[PDB]
Design goal:
Chains A, B, C, D, E: Belongs to the ligand-gated ion channel (TC 1.A.9) family. Acetylcholine receptor (TC 1.A.9.1) subfamily. Alpha-7/CHRNA7 sub-subfamily. 5 copies of one chain form a homopentamer. Chain A has 396 residues and is α+β, with helices and mostly antiparallel strands. The first copy, chain A, has a domain of 207 residues: Acetylcholine Binding Protein, Chain: A. Chain A has 8 helices and 12 strands. In chain A, strands 1, 2, 3, 5, 6, 7 and 9 form a 7-stranded mixed beta sheet that branches. In chain A, strands 4, 8, 10, 11 and 12 form a 5-stranded antiparallel beta sheet that branches. One copy of the ligand COc1cc(OC)c(NC(=O)Nc2cc(C)on2)cc1Cl sits at the interface of chains C and B. One ligand I34 sits at the interface of chains B and A.
Chain lengths: 396, 396, 396, 396, 396
């Protein structure tokens, strides 16, 4: 209308967009800063960045942009674009991204009394420290440090308001716990003026239903097939072909983990310890299997039991496991044939007890390795904090 | 011409590109918003974004850009570039992308009576929630929330017009169902002015011919080779080398699925349940195979049938399966040789019935596992909604 | 010089860069549009885009930028940068890229009589439909739709000139066939003015020397090793270890194809059909091998030939394949030993004919599967159109 | 100072940044163009681009930017930013990148006599043709075509100066040979004015120490294990399990090569021919191994030597290889037992000579395949040009 | 306030942002340059770049921007944005990135006496030379060359101040050692004016806890399973199936290393030498295993010991290893049977000593290969400098 056009011509008369809008150049300008988290787009572990879509809320006052509604009965609010009125230069300190602002400057609301409101939307890529420890059951605390870059505490008194999460669109993978905030003022090497800033800590918990179903459960079940080697009879030449196949094919899990873990030499992830533990157990099974196989094909008449394994694996362990173990010329020739058969029976008896001694080790190590696996998987997986919370919330 | 040059010099005289073009600063300016979907470029499941190429249709009126054709007989339409006339700041709220506008401002058509038309093309990357449940047979609903960012309901009365799909260039992978739209006005924490907005919901159905031919059909056929272990004779030492090879090599399918599924701990995909089901069936085959192998190489004269498997696998299951199962010195020596052979025949008879008992388990488990596989694959795959529609449209 | 400086000061006097340069505001301005393809950078199949480096040729006339050489003896051509003279807004409609123009505005040549020439270089990423059918032997037709965005047929009469390929720098992978063009005028929902546009169809043929040497030839040779299972004697326990190794290791080819094929559920690629065909043939070999192995270890005295395979695999197929197949006490004991040996010979004879019956199946299936493979590979590979052209141009 | 401020106010008085700085508008303006290569960042083979970090050296004269030092005793050089003085529009023609200039306009040095110097730094991504032939031992020639885009030969006489490599920071992977340059003037379809341009050809040699240690040497050593199959005794059922394991696991090398080779159907890389050659040799070993295994388990009394292999593999090849190869009732029964044993010895003798005949083939093919491998690896690897230079410079 | 608005109108009166702010145009302007490292974002080995987030500290003086506080009692500091006051053009020389500045120009602090301070934040991607030698235990020295691009030593006297690391946010993967700096002045081909510059060398040490736990430790343990082949009895046909499985499956480690090592043909990485060493040791085990297997299945009556291995592996090595090794017609027939058995015993005795001779080689090579592995792994891993420091800091 005619009044709005007239008002706009009067507000920008002798207006300098470089000066602070204070009426007295001795008191700081109070700027109220806030934040609104809209969603957590992606939390990259390798690059240790946090990509979020948030809004900002800057609110200050302007002494020069003032008018009364009596002279302009229709207009109660005017809007100035970027570059025509003074705005604070509050920006993210971390800003792990190519261009450093990431604010998408929009129009600036102006009151009927000079109060100024500014709501810029942007996608921020801050740099926070991802702690890969108790990795499937970890809680992350990523900081968001906001503050003015050129105005000190004597010019721009930056206040703070509580963060707003009214509308969050849950990410699904990360469970938001909260977002508390602080205002603190520090000192720097450039200047004696304190520089106040506001830091919003984003606390979020990882939902462990996905990884524990794709990395933990399959690892337990597949590693259980290595315990099945001790049930194969030694006659079927497949004991080594089963133990070595499972062991060397279970490596694919850590190749998946290597694509998720940052190469940080600071803390060993729990999933790495548990994956490392299940390799040694399977690896030791192959070592024990070889010990069994050399008792089976012992090639008798080339040694004897040292009477020490005679009482251990045949007397004590065998029961506790409950396994329970011219005619003279013609006469000389037929006697030799019978004597040859008798010696073969004695050789078969010695070879028979060696085979049973290899069966005791299979049954003994089946129970020894079974208890080793269950108390190790439980011990590692329960060792993490808030593990009972993680399974009571996602699984149950 | 001379008239067009004269008209352009008159329209921008005392024209302010910051004021609303209304003639009375008390009524809202009606802006008609529409949309035209041109193609769905890509639907990323991992990042949960939607990249589309669409046009926009903004249509309002301007009180100041008015003239009569009598004075200017030749010109009936003038065009102003970005930054010289007032335009609404309607933008996508979600805008999961670095720069937030994505509109590629073009020329603005101007009527002979002041009506304004604006048709900006752009490629929009919105953030919608991808629901990975019944994944090969899922229907997605992605929102497109458009609305003014600085003008409230009392200044910019944003109306809505139906979306246009006259020319869609079908994507091939995604089948478009429709695109309905709404206009709603909400309240926010900044202001008491309601902020109307228009939301276009993009409903699209995934064509399941590709994945079901590259992930479902090959999985069924390859998993059928694990059922072939029960047909191998136990003499060929390859029963374990066949069951363990198929099981550990079928893992490559989920490595492909892991590259498509977002790491969302909210719902288990159907293709994950069906892939998990076909691993346990194959995994249980190896466990059963080991049970068979220890009946084959039973090493007789070290145990006896407990008369419980004597009647089950040899009497009941065997029939229902229909398998149907100085001379004295010389005399003493030859008698021993015959007696040795007689004992060997008795040992061979006992070992023979153990081998047949292992054949009954192969035939029994062949039928038990075959019915387990067919009713599980059908049960999981039919469990999804609109599955009959998905196969009647893409396959048939 | 002094004349060029004087001329430049006269041309921009009272010049408006927003008006059409026509002298009468009732006739359209003729704009001649052309194109020059310089190289095809990349044809992405997954994203269905076409990245090309081309030049543009816009040619119109300007009524105001006119002067005579008599007054300015030295200058015959002036050049204006972007934003100082009127230029048409012709742009690519498809433009599957973030920023939509992709033209890199340069200087604009100006005649001595007002004729205007404009040659902008740019790298265009258009969206065309990639048809993955007869994939190694396919010909693609990608469109390039150019036209004005704000001027209709009554204001900007867009003409067309033939595309120029004088200098093409052949891509090596794609063989260019031609690039014909059209001009057509359509109607839209906004306006009653027809909007003429020019479409250049890029026709290109894929050279099939690379893929057919890295995907087709190796697949044929490796799949031929599955036919080698029928030559192994059954005594060497490696028949299953050879058939199952080749089958499960040939999967790597489709993992390579999956990285090239777009996930389009519209047409099955020929290379997918041929790769699927060679899996079933190899897969059926393992099924047949198991049938052979159970004839070898038949465990006689537990069944007999049903006299149906007695005449087929032993009488008909065996010939057409041409394989050609106190003294009394002592007397009783030695008689038993001889009788025991006689029964063993009868048991060995029955087991011998079972082994030969397994050899007939190996020789019979060797010829049955060999003819199955050759007529299937030839049948699928010849089924594609312009296949003889593809091998006569690239291979020969 | 006061003189520099005064001089700057005088130089931009009545100065037009659009006119050529010549004093007479009839002679071309001489522009001296040069180049300085600073490093070769990356040479991508798949996309056929060349990313280099180079400087430019443009040097012309300006008639209007002239002054005497007597009036301004302090200043001898002034600097104008981009957009205030006339600069040539020399740009890279190839420019395989999104934005086409890639020059990062900086300040422009100005002489005390009008001579102008301009040194813009930039990272250029040009499109050159990568020839993958003799791939580990190839030399590439990438062009850099620079020239004006809007000024012809009658306006901007573009000269050339030799390229400067004083400071190159060697890349490590690519060995620079030289960078010669040319100036040539061509004709185009737009205009009759010749357009001179300068082309700098970047000649560079690939260092072959890396690939030949990670692709060539490991391939030779691993392929040598396939020759070890002929030393295994046939009793150990692992001949097929060794030949088929090496063959199907050596495929990983070409999967690495496929990630480096562009999909160009123009020339077969040498490393592809050598990798293809070592597959056929290993593949033929498995075929020969099967021929051996059917001589070992020949199942005698089912055939006889055709007297042709009797003299070849047992008489000629065996020596040149130097391998050197009531009482009557009782009497009848014992005679049968002895006769049964005698027939078994005759059957064992026939089976023994079949096994030795399989040993001759192992020893014969061990020498036949060994000479096949050495003369093929040497023949392919020496076939490339400048191969002796490549090994005398990098290895030795 | 009124004074700040008045002051801003006076400072930009007759102010030229192109002239140097010196009062006498004969002395250079002293500019103090510094740097503050905030974190090391990523050190890419393949592309040889260094992405860091740092601040800059430029400090000079301005003669024209001076005023007294007496006239303006309130304001003591004014701030000018980019493009309104003179600023030096100091920029990174290396700048391995698309856009070359990477400085994110901010406001410029102005003193009450003319001293100027400028603190631009930016993320810099410099190009330094990554030396992949002693790769897990390497220390890198990356340069940061800063200097003016258009002002020489006679105009801009660039000084230097020590780098500041007060607040570093340790990266976790890289351990910072220090960041010393230099100022040097060189000569170039353009000009006779020396161009001073400041170079900051970033010295950083890689923490070796991650790789040595994921690449070194697993390689040692897995390679130890190849030494387990010498403990398997030869009767179980799995010696080759174990040696060849470990060898061909250990290749996955270098596929991981190939994704980290730049393709530089300048220095062989230590981890590559150690991975190459552990392949030959495992590869030689398979060669030795084949030698053992041909002693086991020696097929006697086809050769004899040459009396050279009779004393080595049976007399010397066997002890040092301590292994310790009508009646006439009836009479003729039974005599033949006994004689046949006697010849079999003599054939079994000869075959028995061949099998034991194969056991000596297993025990001899078990000790020979065990000492080969330990002294090779230790020798290679200790060969690197500062290896004891790397394990005393990260592991211990
Ligand atoms: C390669 O590493 C894996 C291994 C796996 O086992 C073999 C799985 N299997 C899996 O996750 N199955 C289920 C079950 C439910 C419920 O959901 N998913 C996945 C990966 Cl990635
Ligand atoms: C690795 O996972 C796969 C496994 C597969 O089986 C082995 C296939 N095979 C396939 O898809 N064959 C056909 C048939 C038709 C018709 O089209 N394609 C593909 C993948 Cl990706
Ligand atoms: C594929 O190459 C690997 C091989 C591996 O062994 C099989 C591992 N295993 C591993 O790292 N285990 C541990 C132990 C601790 C403590 O932390 N991690 C990893 C990779 Cl990448």
């Amino acid at each position: 209308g005619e009044f709005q056009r007239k008002l706009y011509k009067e507000l920008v008369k002798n207006y300098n967009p470089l000066e602070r809008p204070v009426a007295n150049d001795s008191q700081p300008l109070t700027v109220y800063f806030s934040l609104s988290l809209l969603q957590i787009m992606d939390v990259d572990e390798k690059n240790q960045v946090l990509t979020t879509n948030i809004w900002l809320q800057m609110s200050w006052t302007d002494h020069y942009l003032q008018w009364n509604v009596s002279e302009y009965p229709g207009v109660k609010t005017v809007r100035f674009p970027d570059g025509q009125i003074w705005k604070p230069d509050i920006l993210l300190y971390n800003s792990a991204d190519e261009r450093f602002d990431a604010t998408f400057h929009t129009n600036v609301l102006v009151n009927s009394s000079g109060h100024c409101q500014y709501l810029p939307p942007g996608i921020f890529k801050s740099s926070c420290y991802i702690d890969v420890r108790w990795f499937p059951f970890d809680v992350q605390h990523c900081k968001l440090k906001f503050g003015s870059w050129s105005y000190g505490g004597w010019s721009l008194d930056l206040q703070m308001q509580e963060a707003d999460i009214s509308g969050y669109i849950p990410n699904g993978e990360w469970d938001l716990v909260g977002i508390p905030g602080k205002r603190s003022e520090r000192f720097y090497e450039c200047c004696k003026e304190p520089y106040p800033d506001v830091t919003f800590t984003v606390t979020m918990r990882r939902r462990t239903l996905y990884y524990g179903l794709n990395l933990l459960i399959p690892c337990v079940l597949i590693s259980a097939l290595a315990l099945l080697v001790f049930l194969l009879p030694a006659d079927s030449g497949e004991k080594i072909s089963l133990g070595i196949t499972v062991l060397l094919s279970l490596t694919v899990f850590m190749l998946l983990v290597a694509e998720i873990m940052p190469a940080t030499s600071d803390s060993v992830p729990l999933i790495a310890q548990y994956f490392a533990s299940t390799m040694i157990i399977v690896g030791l099974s192959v070592v024990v299997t070889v010990i069994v196989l050399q008792y089976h094909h012992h090639d008798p008449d080339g040694g004897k039991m040292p009477k020490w394994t005679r009482v251990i694996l045949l007397n004590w362990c065998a029961w506790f496991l409950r396994m329970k173990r011219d005619l003279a010329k013609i006469l000389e020739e037929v006697r030799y044939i019978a004597n040859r058969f008798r010696c073969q029976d004695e050789s078969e008896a010695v070879c028979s007890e060696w085979k049973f001694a290899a069966c005791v080790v299979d049954r003994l190590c089946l129970m020894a390795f079974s208890v080793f696996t269950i108390i190790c998987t439980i011990g590692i997986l329960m060792s993490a904090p808030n593990f009972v919370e993680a399974v009571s919330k996602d699984f149950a």
